[PDB]
Amino acid sequence: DLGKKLLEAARAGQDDEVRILLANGADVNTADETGFTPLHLAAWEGHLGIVEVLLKNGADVNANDERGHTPLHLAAYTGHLEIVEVLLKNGAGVNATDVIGTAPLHLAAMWGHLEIVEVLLKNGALVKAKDKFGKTPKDLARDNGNQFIYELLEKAELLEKLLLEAAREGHRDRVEEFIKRGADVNTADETGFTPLHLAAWEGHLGIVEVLLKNGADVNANDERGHTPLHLAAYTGHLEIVEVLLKNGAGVNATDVIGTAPLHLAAMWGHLEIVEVLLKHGADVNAQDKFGKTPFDLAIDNGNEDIAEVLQKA
């Protein structure tokens, strides 16, 4: 009984009635049929006073409704700047995501709330956070014509963009420069390729050594599960395969299809890479979607020379 009253006194904005109910023992973390709590409703309707009293009585600042929305999601959706700052001040998760990977920044940027975008960024909101549909806040702001927000997130991405371009084009002095200026060495592009993915793909050995030297993730996956070692075994750059394994590259890393670096080394006839992978404990028993082992793939592509090595094991 008290639960329902508190929930509707928050929705309705009745400050005095919320005080009375909480003093009579009403549960501050009460939840309705879909998981909305009093703090959810006060944030949606924009009742700053109530928000502050509920948190003051031990209200869960990161409660999740049935869909995964938190009070911060709702404040950023409706554009209530003052309430956003209160929620973060009380320990609200700035990078919380609902069931389709939506963060507060996605919503602020989509509904065109410049000030909230800025406050969310100031508290560590991920600039390139991708939702369930591959969309960042910058994408959502572009598609909705929120010009100022687009230009702000584009600026907030530029440094990480130039590192990715530098690593792809093979410009070592630019890679070094942008790392020295705070570039996130593990940033990702539109498909999950990190600078290390792109240097291995293009065969830029020098830059692969520099990236690992500055704490690049050697076993990073893109959106399809490919690690850097995967790409180096496909393209057939032996020296990059050697550098990755020296830094703990998962030799038996499997992508979304189960394919491992040894599958591609045999499929595209790269004898030298096969040896090094087996030296580091590459399992030949592993299969994949098609159910084929690295030995089967060596015969299909007319490469019996590599197949004879696998037989011996």
Numbering used by the authors: 13 to 325
Paper lines:
In this paper, we present a strategy to fuse specific, high-affinity protein binders to obtain multivalent or multispecific scaffolds of predetermined geometry. DARPins are used as building blocks to confer the desired specificity to the construct. A series of rigid connector modules replacing the DARPin capping repeats allow to combine the individual DARPin domains in such a way that their distance and angle can be altered to test different geometries, bringing the binding partners of the DARPins into a defined spatial arrangement. The two helices are not just joined end-to-end, but instead the two domains are made to overlap in such a way that the joining helix is stabilized by contacts with the domain cores along its entire length.
In the context of DARPin-β-lactamase fusions, we observed that the paratope of this DARPin has a high propensity to form major crystal contacts, leading to crystal formation under a wide variety of conditions. Indeed, constructs D12_Hxx_D12 with H02, H09, H11, H13 and H15 yielded diffraction-quality crystals in space groups P212121, P6122, P212121, C2 and P1, respectively, at resolutions ranging from 1.8 Å to 3.5 Å. Only three of the D12 constructs did not rely on paratope-paratope interactions, but instead relied on paratope-capping repeat or paratope-connector module interactions as dominant crystal contacts: D12_H11_D12, D12_H13_D12 and D12_H12_D12_H12_D12 (P21). The propensity of DARPin D12 to engage in crystal contacts is so large that, where the crystal geometry does not allow for its preferred interaction, alternative interaction geometries are observed. These are found as paratope-paratope interactions, interactions with the DARPin N- and C-caps, with connector modules or with the target protein of a second DARPin in the construct.
